[PDB]
Motif scaffolding. Structure first.
Motif, PDB file in Angstrom:
ATOM      1  N   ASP A  32       0.851  -1.185   0.000  1.00 49.13           N
ATOM      2  CA  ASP A  32       0.000   0.000   0.000  1.00 49.13           C
ATOM      3  C   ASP A  32       0.890   1.239   0.000  1.00 49.13           C
ATOM      4  O   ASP A  32       1.511   1.566   1.016  1.00 49.13           O
ATOM      5  CB  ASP A  32      -0.933  -0.011   1.210  1.00 49.13           C
ATOM      6  CG  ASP A  32      -1.913   1.146   1.203  1.00 49.13           C
ATOM      7  OD1 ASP A  32      -2.119   1.751   0.129  1.00 49.13           O
ATOM      8  OD2 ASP A  32      -2.479   1.451   2.273  1.00 49.13           O
ATOM      9  N   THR A  87      -0.987   7.431   0.881  1.00 50.73           N
ATOM     10  CA  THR A  87      -0.517   8.289   1.954  1.00 50.73           C
ATOM     11  C   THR A  87      -1.497   9.436   2.144  1.00 50.73           C
ATOM     12  O   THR A  87      -2.158   9.872   1.198  1.00 50.73           O
ATOM     13  CB  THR A  87       0.887   8.837   1.660  1.00 50.73           C
ATOM     14  OG1 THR A  87       1.262   9.778   2.673  1.00 50.73           O
ATOM     15  CG2 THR A  87       0.917   9.523   0.303  1.00 50.73           C
ATOM     16  N   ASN A 115       3.129  -1.007   4.117  1.00 53.56           N
ATOM     17  CA  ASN A 115       2.615   0.319   3.796  1.00 53.56           C
ATOM     18  C   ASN A 115       3.711   1.342   4.084  1.00 53.56           C
ATOM     19  O   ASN A 115       4.862   0.990   4.360  1.00 53.56           O
ATOM     20  CB  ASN A 115       1.328   0.610   4.578  1.00 53.56           C
ATOM     21  CG  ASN A 115       1.578   0.800   6.059  1.00 53.56           C
ATOM     22  OD1 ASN A 115       2.311   0.031   6.680  1.00 53.56           O
ATOM     23  ND2 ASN A 115       0.975   1.835   6.633  1.00 53.56           N
TER      24      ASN A 115
END
Lengths: 283, 280, 286, 286
Positions: B23, B26, B262
């Motif tokens: 991922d 942001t 992420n």
């Protein structure tokens, strides 16, 4: 700072031997000794059926890449075992290895009595790479496996924990990802635990000249893996010429550096080698 | 002793992640999330409707420029807002202004971000400009820059900046500058305490530089020269979807090298290796 | 290590100064002020009467080189002093400097009302230079003298003790002799001794762009001396890398200096040298 | 880290000497002094008998290479001995050296009155070299011997204890073998041992300009050995990169060394080796 090969030089020590009585034999595994401490890389433009024979006959070893197939690949390795002081098994058939990916297809390779299977990728400290090692030793325990690539003492212990007999350490990846580690610092980081775990080290990357091979071996590596410098040759599928001429230039260069430090074999080479740190004005 | 992107390398860590569940999304402000942590710089040879719509359709963001005359700037903020995605389903976009009256017309096209863009953000004229914008349009998000120190970051934050932009000819002409990696790291603690995102502006040439800047604490990366030769722009790079896909591909690969699913895990797991002068 | 200009960068500071209203004037000596803190080097490819007039007109100063014969050098000084922010003396004539080496020049130069005598030598920290500075001030006390070149603190003390009003701090000589000192460290090693004695400093050498002028001035030098950057101009000697009008070259250097002081938040040179902080950059930080 | 010549600069010191009266003579052994502290290397493209004659006439010394056959090398030495500031022996004949490589040479070379035998090899810190030194000193005790090459204090004491009167300190080696040592740190690592042993040091390698010659001598070397810088001269082997008359090449570095000693304020090599201070320069300084 983390050191690369161009950051150090080998300090000259007192010598009483000549590059005639100098032994460059290396013991990678329990019953596995190379007369020439050089491995061929697993690239389609490098190690084929012909180059694998040329590597074994010169005293080293070549590994067969994965971009053939499972079975179109076993046709290449079985040719190597059809055939001076080359490296061959107790049977007398020349040693040879093969690169594998991450169900595994090592059976067809072990059935030809493969000498070594190479589980190598960009990130050796993976979990699917970690479980690929235990998968091969669970199925073929007698088979010897080299794993990589790792650049950390933590990644070396993870691969050693998974049962790897040898490890591999080691650009576009620096530019695209920003990930990397200078080879000299990476080699010295993983050999202080590998020398206590009894595991040999194959340095893969950063080798431009024969002097880099001397530094990698003096740092603690038992063998170096070379690919691009064996590409423009006859036995390979720029132009280099014959393979035996290239390897003899490396062997002679490695022998002459050992005479500078006063070492007749590799064991005492790593015991008395001293690195001098050079400045940026290294030309 | 002041580090730039080329002075460090991301150390590989143990990883069980693969670039399929990575991922790269942001947050840059409240209710503002980019699926691609890339913004297009305010170069008049770069960002307009064809590029801003392309940056927005790719998951990033564009900043339509103030080199446009004010009525043509909003006329192109209009062109992007009529066919990433705001509350009403309109393609989000930003616009740059200098040192506040011209922001009124930008609010009435419902622009998503206004960028007080200058070369020296730690100045009184920029501080007074940010205060004046949040006075007449407090529901309007303001990105201010450029700064490179912790003191300049706090001055803009104290003035009401929602996003801080950190950022050669200026080195040759004035001798003034700061290596971007050290500039980013000197700002993160002041920005994280205030809940302010950081946009890294300048010094990026490869996708690896984007990974280093984000791992250093930046929430987003602003590129300009690497999107100049593209087609969606006013050398020749080609389709902007291919250069952007290369950036995200390199960022996802490096995050897999450190074992991060992420961006927040990326910034907590990343460790920088100091590389020697010969280690290039 | 010893650092040069490319090893450091000026850190941005808070600023409320607009670059239009920035004063870059400097006081090189008592009753000697340059509106442009730039001096032209004493090289025969740089400073004759034509460029010295142009340097003085722009607010700087020119140093007539000493490859001219003593009579030629006196004639070149006369042509400058007979020709807005121009460097002018009390009687309204353009000011000029003259380079002498280590008798047959200073006397004739003094009577054509030269504004500054420059004892220019590759090694100012030597007995010959100290004797020359002493003898010039002994015979011509009302004549300003700039001595050089030095690169150490003890060398600056010797010139000041000899009576020098200004000291000059300053490659083929590096490769031929192996002797040298990086200019940034040389300036910093001298400014604390010099400003204690009230003697200004002129940085000579290592200036490639206007950013180097900002660093040299921020490091403590009151003025810079440039040579090859003015060699291809019209007012430069010859008929030739052609560079164009000297006014635009000097306008570019003054523009970069003003823009640099704006980044530091300074309005004059004294505030510049008090607010400036240097950031050491890495090898890859180009 | 270990430093090379490009890593440092000589610091300017106070001076009261002009380079006109600077003595660059050096003593490499008892009753053996050179007016020019330069020796030509034992390379087949450098030191002929013709070049060795030009070296000895300029005040230096030549080392006849050993790619000659032993009979050819004896004939070359004969031509030099039978041919101002020239380096001559007690009989007024030009002096010359000759290189051997660890039986059929030293004898015949001693019979033709060679002034110095050079045990030249890539690794002087070895048993074969130490045995060669002690056996030349056993059969020919009156014959001066220079041994090399080494780069450590340990290798220096082995050669000195073997009987070497002169020590030589010192490309393709670093890339083929990865072995080497920066020459400036190598020279400075030997001076302490050599000074207490009373033997002189010859710096062989890493010299590109006259400034390197000054740095090598300032670091403690009594003489330098240059090779490639003399390869394309008139007196060098070959026929017609052409560099011209070797007397002009040696005149350049002689002037570079003299002016370098003028910056430090030294009148002789001894004062040069005590007053010299090195400045470590930045990576951006080169």
């Amino acid at each position: 700072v983390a050191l690369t090969f161009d950051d150090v030089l080998l300090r000259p020590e007192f010598s009483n031997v000549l590059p005639r009585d100098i032994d460059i034999s290396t013991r990678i595994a329990k019953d596995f000794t190379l007369n020439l401490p050089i491995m061929s890389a697993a690239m389609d433009q490098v190690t084929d059926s012909r180059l694998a024979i040329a590597m074994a006959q010169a005293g080293g070893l070549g590994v067969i890449h994965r971009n053939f197939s499972p079975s179109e690949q076993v046709a290449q390795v079985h040719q190597v075992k059809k055939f001076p002081n080359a490296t061959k098994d107790s049977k007398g058939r020349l040693r040879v290895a093969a690169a594998v990916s991450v169900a595994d297809r090592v059976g067809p390779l072990f059935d030809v009595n493969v000498d070594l299977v190479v589980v190598d990728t960009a990130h050796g400290h993976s979990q699917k790479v970690l479980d690929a090692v235990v998968q091969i030793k669970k199925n073929f325990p007698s088979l010897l496996v080299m794993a990589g690539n790792i650049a950390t003492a933590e990644g070396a212990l993870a691969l050693i924990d998974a049962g790897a007999d040898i490890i591999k350490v080691g650009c576009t990846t620096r530019v695209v990802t920003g990930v990397g580690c200078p080879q000299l610092s990476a080699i010295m980081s993983v050999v202080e635990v590998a020398e206590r775990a009894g595991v040999a080290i194959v340095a893969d990357g950063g080798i431009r000249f024969s002097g880099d091979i001397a530094k990698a071996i003096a740092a603690g590596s038992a063998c170096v893996m070379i690919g691009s410098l064996l590409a423009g040759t006859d036995e390979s599928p720029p132009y280099k010429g014959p393979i035996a001429s290239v390897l003899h230039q490396m062997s002679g260069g490695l022998k002459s550096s050992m005479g500078y430090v006063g070492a007749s074999n590799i064991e005492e080479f790593q015991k008395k080698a001293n690195f001098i740190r050079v400045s940026v004005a290294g030309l």
